[PDB]
Design an enzyme around this catalytic site. Sequence first.
Site, PDB file in Angstrom:
ATOM      1  N   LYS A  41       0.880  -1.192   0.000  1.00  0.00           N
ATOM      2  CA  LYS A  41       0.000   0.000   0.000  1.00  0.00           C
ATOM      3  C   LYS A  41       0.910   1.232   0.000  1.00  0.00           C
ATOM      4  CE  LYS A  41      -4.074   1.538   2.776  1.00  0.00           C
ATOM      5  NZ  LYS A  41      -3.518   2.721   3.472  1.00  0.00           N
ATOM      6  N   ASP A  43      11.865   7.177  -8.713  1.00  0.00           N
ATOM      7  CA  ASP A  43      11.569   6.327  -7.516  1.00  0.00           C
ATOM      8  C   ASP A  43      12.478   5.087  -7.533  1.00  0.00           C
ATOM      9  OD1 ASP A  43      10.021   6.153  -5.103  1.00  0.00           O
ATOM     10  OD2 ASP A  43       8.326   5.098  -6.112  1.00  0.00           O
ATOM     11  N   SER A  95      -2.550   0.983  -4.144  1.00  0.00           N
ATOM     12  CA  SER A  95      -2.361  -0.345  -3.525  1.00  0.00           C
ATOM     13  C   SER A  95      -2.135  -1.341  -4.636  1.00  0.00           C
ATOM     14  CB  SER A  95      -3.567  -0.728  -2.700  1.00  0.00           C
ATOM     15  OG  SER A  95      -3.413  -2.034  -2.213  1.00  0.00           O
TER      16      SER A  95
HETATM   17  C1  LIG Z   1       5.919 -11.455  -1.912  1.00  0.00           C
HETATM   18  C2  LIG Z   1       5.552 -10.504  -3.010  1.00  0.00           C
HETATM   19  C3  LIG Z   1       5.237 -10.799  -4.351  1.00  0.00           C
HETATM   20  C4  LIG Z   1       5.077  -9.670  -5.107  1.00  0.00           C
HETATM   21  N1  LIG Z   1       4.972  -9.652  -6.479  1.00  0.00           N
HETATM   22  C5  LIG Z   1       4.653  -8.550  -7.241  1.00  0.00           C
HETATM   23  N2  LIG Z   1       4.316  -8.773  -8.515  1.00  0.00           N
HETATM   24  C6  LIG Z   1       3.980  -7.698  -9.227  1.00  0.00           C
HETATM   25  C7  LIG Z   1       3.988  -6.408  -8.733  1.00  0.00           C
HETATM   26  C8  LIG Z   1       3.573  -5.265  -9.629  1.00  0.00           C
HETATM   27  C9  LIG Z   1       4.349  -6.256  -7.386  1.00  0.00           C
HETATM   28  N3  LIG Z   1       4.432  -4.967  -6.750  1.00  0.00           N
HETATM   29  C10 LIG Z   1       4.438  -4.625  -5.324  1.00  0.00           C
HETATM   30  C11 LIG Z   1       5.061  -3.261  -5.802  1.00  0.00           C
HETATM   31  C12 LIG Z   1       6.529  -3.280  -5.420  1.00  0.00           C
HETATM   32  C13 LIG Z   1       7.473  -2.957  -6.486  1.00  0.00           C
HETATM   33  N4  LIG Z   1       8.256  -2.682  -7.263  1.00  0.00           N
HETATM   34  N5  LIG Z   1       4.350  -2.176  -5.178  1.00  0.00           N
HETATM   35  C14 LIG Z   1       4.790  -0.891  -5.713  1.00  0.00           C
HETATM   36  C15 LIG Z   1       3.820   0.167  -5.256  1.00  0.00           C
HETATM   37  N6  LIG Z   1       3.934   0.315  -3.817  1.00  0.00           N
HETATM   38  C16 LIG Z   1       3.092   1.427  -3.378  1.00  0.00           C
HETATM   39  C17 LIG Z   1       3.505  -0.946  -3.217  1.00  0.00           C
HETATM   40  C18 LIG Z   1       4.338  -2.113  -3.705  1.00  0.00           C
HETATM   41  C19 LIG Z   1       4.660  -3.622  -7.301  1.00  0.00           C
HETATM   42  N7  LIG Z   1       4.662  -7.334  -6.658  1.00  0.00           N
HETATM   43  S1  LIG Z   1       5.099  -8.277  -4.090  1.00  0.00           S
HETATM   44  N8  LIG Z   1       5.489  -9.181  -2.752  1.00  0.00           N
END
Ligand SMILES: Cc1cc(Nc2ncc(C)c(N3CC(CC#N)(N4CCN(C)CC4)C3)n2)sn1
Lengths: 282, 279
Positions: B15, B132, B20
């Site tokens: 988040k 970022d 999110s």
């Molecule tokens: C254990 C686990 C698995 C994940 N796999 C995953 N597969 C796709 C995406 C797009 C993703 N993510 C979380 C992310 C982090 C980065 N880079 N977001 C970014 C925006 N932030 C506000 C929250 C976190 C994009 N994660 S995540 N964790």
Amino acid sequence: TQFEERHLKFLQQLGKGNFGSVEMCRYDPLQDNTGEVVAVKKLQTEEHLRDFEREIEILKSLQHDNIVKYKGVCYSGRRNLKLIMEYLPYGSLRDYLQKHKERIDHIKLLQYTSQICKGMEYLGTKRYIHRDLATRNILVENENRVKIGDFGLTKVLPQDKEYYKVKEPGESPIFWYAPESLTESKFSVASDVWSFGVVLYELFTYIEKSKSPPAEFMRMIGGQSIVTHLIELLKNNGRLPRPDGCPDEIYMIMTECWNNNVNQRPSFRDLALRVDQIRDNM
Amino acid sequence: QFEERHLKFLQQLGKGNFGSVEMCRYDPLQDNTGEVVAVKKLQHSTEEHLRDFEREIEILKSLQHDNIVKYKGVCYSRRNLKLIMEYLPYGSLRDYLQKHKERIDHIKLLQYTSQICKGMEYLGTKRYIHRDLATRNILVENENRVKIGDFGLTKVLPQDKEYYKVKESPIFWYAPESLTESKFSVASDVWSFGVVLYELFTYIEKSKSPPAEFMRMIGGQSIVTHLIELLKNNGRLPRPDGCPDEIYMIMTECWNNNVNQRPSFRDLALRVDQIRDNM
Ligand SMILES: Cc1cc(Nc2ncc(C)c(N3CC(CC#N)(N4CCN(C)CC4)C3)n2)sn1
Ligand SMILES: Cc1cc(Nc2ncc(C)c(N3CC(CC#N)(N4CCN(C)CC4)C3)n2)sn1
């Protein structure tokens, strides 16, 4: 070479132990401030004095690039007995690494490691067991050489045995101690190798307090003595973690030095070769 | 096209203030066999945030590369706009490294670093400024590949300028000129990449984090004011314990005060590949 107390001039306290002190002194028979700066060890009993005399005989017997140089003795004299050694201005590998870590890479740690092994291999040839192998007992001569700098717990193996069992009631560096040194007080070349594993761990953790042997072991331990907890943790194959960025082959060496079985621990000759090779490959 | 009715919520991934990311199964056969995907949505769906998100979606749709998270599609249902991406099961390089550090050597860090540079080089070719760059915004596909996983702050450079002026922020990752003037460029991306390198070689240790170190150097004025003064006085993050000479030197060049004296991503990729080959 004879040292007269009257020409031994106190400059600075370097380190204090439970039963010892080391001082920076100028030996100045011309009393003009031109005399050689030396390191002077002395006591702070008759048992400790018998042991110190043995410590003095031990270092006098050692001539090697990677062992602090014996210079002589200085008597008033048994109460005032002093062991005189070269003064290495960079001090313990422990304080040097803490101070200068941001200028010391993996290559440099492996150079120091190799010199520790060769110093320890030579101790082996005399059948001397160090029993206190730790970066605090290693001195830095310069950027390119370290030496073993203290022999306060060192023992001579009996003629016909591969271990020395010590009966002393004093504090012990338990987080550096092999299982069989903790349980049975058995010190050997293999318990030296165990201790060397923790020296390796010390170097690659850059002696950060958060990752120190006491800190890590106490974290894994979590109504019995700490010693009992440590023995049980080591029996259960509890071990110090891989230091962040430690190369594979240096962790593998750590892990083999920390074999429960005395007979399966590497030799100092083998350790020197493997460390030289890891260093060459970088 | 993804239909909300088939997008089945499995788990919250992360988040922020305004959005999110969720782990979801896309299951049009409603038999629990549908492909697991990652679904991004807005916490607050103002008209401005929705215009920005549409831009964010166009940005990632335009990116096709080994080291950028794969765009899969969108969900209309416009107020309830979702961006659908591949789900990378190992999560952020930040959490992966924290978890798995005891099995990751310098060689592995340099492989990841190189792949970040190539992802960043490609962003370069589109004139996109990430803004970022941090290990929290890099995902682990497997043991041998990472991707840039989020484009939540990414900007397109105007036609006639080499920077975008954007008027909370990850300040300990921010180039002096981003802090003082809000100027973002490829050179501020490089600055940020220096800190990513710093993050990796400190193995995400809390005691050695950028916030921890900068706050230690600082000690009735903002942290931002103190940071600007510290960076102007050539205060910098220390060499991580056992960081190779050439990787510290690269960090230090990414953190040049002068934008024009920072290395290119093409140059960074070559130097990191070469340090890795030499080990
Ligand atoms: C254990 C686990 C698995 C994940 N796999 C995953 N597969 C796709 C995406 C797009 C993703 N993510 C979380 C992310 C982090 C980065 N880079 N977001 C970014 C925006 N932030 C506000 C929250 C976190 C994009 N994660 S995540 N964790
Ligand atoms: C600043 C500084 C320089 C030092 N130089 C030095 N030069 C010779 C010796 C023999 C020596 N020392 C400290 C030593 C540790 C080792 N090796 N002692 C052992 C006894 N302990 C109770 C205290 C530390 C022997 N130091 S030390 N610091």
